[PDB]
């Protein structure tokens, strides 16, 4: 799947 | 040919959980460009932060910092809808520039990396030799941060659903569901699998009405 960031 | 330029690790950024994702593979000849797009790891985020490393562990703390930039004014949406494309360009003099932009707000930041950057010789020999003696455990903590990127999206879907699920919920699953989050917490934070997947389990066993609801 499409991977992802935090803040 | 005899020789050419490559850039000689891995460059990438730090994606949910802690590990580095891989946008140029090492030995890659320069000049060249790649770009992945990515999206947010929680709702409602409004920014993302851009963490540039290089080197070949699955941790991001274990690889070499190159900088960082954030970007900002993301409209906050539910989690994996924002399309933020990320680039890196790595020229013919090594001059590294990565940018990110979201689609939908068309804002967009970047920055430059000097090609003096990063590590040395003896380093990334020393790097290329870590990666391969630590291998194995490098494998089991990306298995450990996508059972943790799992359970953490359901700890928030499930309190999300609570919500949606006012008076509806019976307050006696509301409080079962309430102590198995508390658990499933807890086992976030530690670092064994399958303890996090049993309170994924256990966490889904009484959500069944929760479910029904939906």
């Known amino acids: ?7 | 040919v005899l020789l050419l330029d490559v850039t000689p690790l891995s460059l990438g950024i730090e994606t949910m959980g802690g590990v580095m994702t891989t946008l140029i593979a090492k030995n890659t000849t320069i000049p060249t460009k790649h770009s992945q797009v990515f999206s947010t790891a929680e709702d409602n985020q409004s920014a993302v932060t851009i963490h540039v490393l290089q080197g070949e562990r699955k941790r991001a703390a274990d690889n070499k910092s190159l900088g960082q930039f954030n970007l900002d004014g993301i409209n906050p949406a539910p989690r994996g809808m924002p399309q933020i494309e990320v680039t890196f360009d790595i020229d013919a003099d090594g001059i590294l520039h990565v940018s990110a932009k979201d689609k939908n707000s068309g804002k967009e930041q970047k920055i430059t990396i000097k090609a003096s950057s990063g590590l040395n010789e003896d380093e990334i020999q020393k790097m290329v030799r870590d990666a391969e003696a630590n291998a194995e455990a490098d494998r089991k903590f990306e298995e450990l941060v996508q059972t943790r990127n799992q359970g953490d999206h359901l700890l928030h879907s499930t309190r999300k659903q609570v919500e949606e699920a006012g008076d509806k919920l019976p307050a006696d699953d509301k409080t079962a569901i309430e102590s198995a989050l508390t658990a499933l917490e807890t086992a976030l934070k530690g670092e064994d699998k399958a303890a996090i997947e049993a309170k994924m389990q256990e966490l889904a066993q009484v959500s069944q009405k929760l479910m029904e609801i939906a």
């Open chain 1, 1 to 7: 799947n499409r991977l992802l960031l935090t803040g």
